[PDB]
Design a protein around this ligand. Structure first.
Ligand SMILES: O=C(O)CNC(=O)NC1CCCCC1
Ligand SMILES: O=C(O)CNC(=O)NC1CCCCC1
Ligand SMILES: [Mg+2]
Ligand SMILES: [Mg+2]
Lengths: 547, 547
């Protein structure tokens, strides 16, 4: 029956009710109980506040109009008002004080995730205060999590006025019988019920939910803590920068603030950051999730030299150059991590801070060459099998779906022998033709990667592994340096190829290196433990990158 | 003969020579003349500074190494050093003190603009200081104005070492005989001359130029002040955001900082901002030059309603939503200006500040309808001729090249009667088939607009003029409000359709409205007086938007 959940802002998705603050201001200032609220609701339908609620006048225009009310109302009850009394000062404080009632927003999401059409019906105003950005940001966040957002000062109708409820109904394209309306104000519930909608008086959050859980027959309370917000490719802003005649890099941009450039690994995409992209943005940053040269919508020249670490790095400096960014926080995973370490070693000027996940910085050995060293570690055997051009491509491209479902797996799921790969003659030689779906990725998520690699295949990506000798000779130029800029090394316990023990000597080249670890975390960090990663990175960015 | 000009950074394109500061530090601190410089050049080819110059060690690694030198050198001349002596403190100050020697950079540009291949050959270092961003930004600017930038700490060679000069020669793809090398250090000139290159000892800027002007046979000195920097479309970063199922907006992004959204007018493009885009970026902002719905790479649905002011505005709020921007500075011209005024009236929350060029805010008249009002102003007659769908399209699309060359003209150039257009049955009825090339635009610039309008034509753009009634009824909803957020109204003297006298009553609806005017400035402001516009907007942004 029910198919729509509509939430109120002040007192439901947002607390504490910017409203309530009035009652406290009075108690606080020992003012006649209701003095402030009466001046607020003064004029009723023809009130200054009702106007301000219908978008007739701005909040800034209202404040003075709401001051007079505090004098008239004070003139009736035979009272006064302190000298430092400020309606502005009061509301700015009340508003910024209000925060997203997390459990409520989550309850809303759940409903949506299970077929419900969500919407926010609220009696708000046109905020032109200097601190208006407060609201702006709060909404900037809530907005995305709801199909609709019906603002009073926008639709020219406020709440109890039935008109708006017909509007809501008509907007949702649903009849009262299949809609749940939650408000903290009783009056706003009647019109709702008179239409025959399920209404819930939201007093204490937990109870409202109980009723909601009840009426909707979905478990909203004491429910497992979700995964961070994932972003829909088609809703993202896509960016393209030509760094060289035949090379254009594609990236997804979201947020404002210190620029944080995310460089995924092999064989991934910008999408590999789908969980930290909103989080970090929301965290106060301007996230630039890259599509590393050779992947997704980025250029993939066939040439192997085109993917040596030096070239790749210069192109990233150029990417910044073209974008007008002097610096930028570089956070990389897998190959991306290798890339950002060399970005801090050759372009400190452009790297605001450096951070790597799984990939440890290990100064190249002046004597022994890469090929030799790699051969000295059964786990890296897969890298040798990536040398012969075409060979690896053929297997990986054979069945994209199977390729990604076989790769992207938790540490406990495995299904890909990694020891004797060159020996087995293949990476999948003894793997299922139809691998089970990993916990980390949904069918869609995998198909996204598929369509992406259908463009340029695995030749470009694989070439990242085909410049060992070159990258080595380059790295040798930096054997005298040291990472002195803010750095963070996040290691993942259950990563059996990029084992944490490999980063134990990093502090020698990176003295003030900070760290992070993650339990039961396979190689595919972003996907495996998204919450932990966002938490770890934001904490670090906030203390070392925002400066 | 000459075809290449290579400039040194410290002492040529950048002053005052971060170097020289040493001599002053000594004089300042009454230190034995050269004490500090000797500790600096200590070790010669095998010096700590030579290493740091070849990229062997970072500046941060060097500082301590350069301190010891100040003790050894002080130990020889029988001297000491104050307690608050800091090599770090000294250099940070010296470096941020250095600025782009404007006349020199300009001289360089000129040369390039006249066929010269320019390049910066410098003995720099890997700056990993906390204030490294200083250099980063200075280079971020110089870099673009030169074909090449050969850094010592990057190429593994410092200056006098001939190797680098062969490198320069080989990089420029030119022989000594056709290259001019300018340095403030004599030693760096010999290797140059030994190759047979024209060298110029740069002491005082003006003289160096005189010699340069001489050797190159091009007037570099006392030459007219150029136009701001224009941006090459193919070098710009392009962004795409889908705001609705069938609507994707295209924009050009450059810079970092408060987001400033530029909304061009009819019939233009993001390119109409080609002069303020770098300037503003360089000014400390994140410029987002839009391609307004109906233009360039943006979607152009045929529907007329799709271009009413309300719809257009919601889509801009969505553009922000998708980009993760809570606010944004909206600056518009012509129709764009009309758009940003309504953006401040319906979405104050999202507009950090509002600014308009030419277009004045004029509250809609509750009684009289648009059609009627417009008919009451012979100059607006052109707008009536834009009503009948197809008609205007046919003429404007007939000859794009002629269309734009006829439109984009200084106030003194004219060539398009505007009075009786509906009467003449056409906007070009008595205009040349091959209009002369305006001072404001080069042939290429015009052809850019052409190729752009070859995509969606003039139907989309023209529809902006086809929603009068609708926009009117919408505007009436805001007749009670007022623009209380930071606003700037820039008027152009010689604009005969959007005359300055039309903005004389704005302060009534926008109390704290700031202003700007421009002399002899036709309608096409961005193009007519680019310098004045950048100056006006940056001044305002810096005091009202950066806050
Ligand atoms: O480039 C590096 O330094 C190390 N890269 C990897 O370990 N990549 C994974 C690819 C997928 C299978 C596991 C290893
Ligand atoms: O939209 C408005 O409010 C006013 N627009 C114009 O004046 N546009 C120009 C187009 C090219 C010819 C001159 C007028
Ligand atoms: Mg409420
Ligand atoms: Mg010099």
């Amino acid at each position: 029956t029910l198919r729509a959940a509509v939430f109120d802002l002040d007192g439901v998705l947002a607390l504490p009710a910017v409203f309530g603050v009035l009652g406290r201001t009075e108690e606080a200032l020992a003012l006649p109980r209701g003095l402030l609220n009466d001046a607020f609701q003064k004029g009723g339908p023809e009130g200054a506040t009702t106007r301000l609620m219908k978008g007739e006048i701005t909040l800034s225009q209202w404040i003075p109009l709401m001051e007079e009310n505090c004098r008239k109302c004070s003139e009736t009850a035979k009272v006064c008002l302190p000298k430092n009394f400020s309606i502005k000062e009061i509301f700015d404080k009340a508003i910024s004080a209000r925060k997203i009632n997390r459990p409520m927003l989550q309850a809303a999401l759940m409903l949506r995730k299970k077929g419900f059409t969500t919407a926010i019906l609220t009696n708000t105003w046109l905020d032109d205060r200097a601190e208006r950005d407060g609201l702006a940001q709060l909404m900037c966040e809530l907005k995305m999590h709801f199909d609709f957002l019906i603002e009073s000062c926008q639709v020219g109708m406020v709440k109890p006025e039935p008109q708006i409820y017909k509007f809501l109904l008509d907007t949702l394209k649903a009849s009262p019988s299949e809609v749940v309306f939650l408000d903290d104000i009783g009056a706003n519930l009647k019109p709702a019920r008179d239409l025959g909608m399920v209404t819930i008086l939201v007093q204490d959050t937990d109870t409202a939910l109980k009723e909601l859980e009840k009426v909707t027959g979905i478990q909203l309370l004491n429910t497992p803590a979700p995964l961070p917000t994932s972003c829909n490719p088609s809703d993202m802003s896509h960016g393209y920068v030509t760094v060289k005649p035949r090379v254009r890099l594609h990236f997804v941009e979201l947020g404002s603030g210190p620029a944080v450039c995310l460089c995924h690994g092999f064989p991934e995409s910008w999408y590999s950051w789908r969980y930290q992209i909103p989080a970090l943005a929301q965290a106060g940053y301007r996230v630039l999730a890259m599509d590393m040269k050779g992947y997704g919508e980025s250029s993939a020249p066939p040439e192997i030299e085109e993917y040596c670490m030096e070239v790749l790095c210069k192109e990233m400096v150029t990417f910044l150059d073209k974008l007008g960014l002097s610096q930028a926080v570089f956070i990389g995973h897998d190959w991306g991590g290798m890339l950002v370490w060399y970005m801090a070693l050759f372009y400190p000027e452009r790297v605001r801070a450096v951070a790597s996940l799984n990939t440890p910085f290990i100064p190249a050995n002046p004597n022994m060459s890469p090929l030799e060293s790699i051969k000295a570690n059964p786990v890296f055997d897969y890298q040798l099998y990536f040398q012969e051009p075409g060979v690896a491509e053929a297997e990986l491209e054979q069945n994209l779906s199977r390729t990604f479902k076989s790769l992207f797996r938790a540490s406990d799921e495995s299904v890909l022998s990694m020891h004797k790969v060159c020996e087995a003659g293949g990476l999948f030689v003894n793997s299922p033709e139809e691998p089970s779906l990993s916990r980390m990725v949904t069918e869609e998520e995998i198909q996204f990667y598929v369509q992406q690699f259908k463009k340029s295949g695995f030749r470009g990506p694989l070439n990242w592994y085909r410049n060992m000798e070159r990258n080595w000779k380059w790295a040798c130029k930096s054997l005298g340096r040291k990472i002195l800029i803010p750095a963070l090394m996040v290691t993942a316990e259950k990563d059996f190829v990029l084992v944490p023990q490999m980063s134990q000597h990093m502090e020698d080249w990176i003295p003030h290196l900070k760290r992070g670890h993650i339990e039961d975390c396979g190689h595919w960090t972003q996907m495996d433990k998204p919450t932990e990663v966002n938490q770890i990175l934001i904490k670090w960015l906030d203390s070392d990158a925002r400066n």
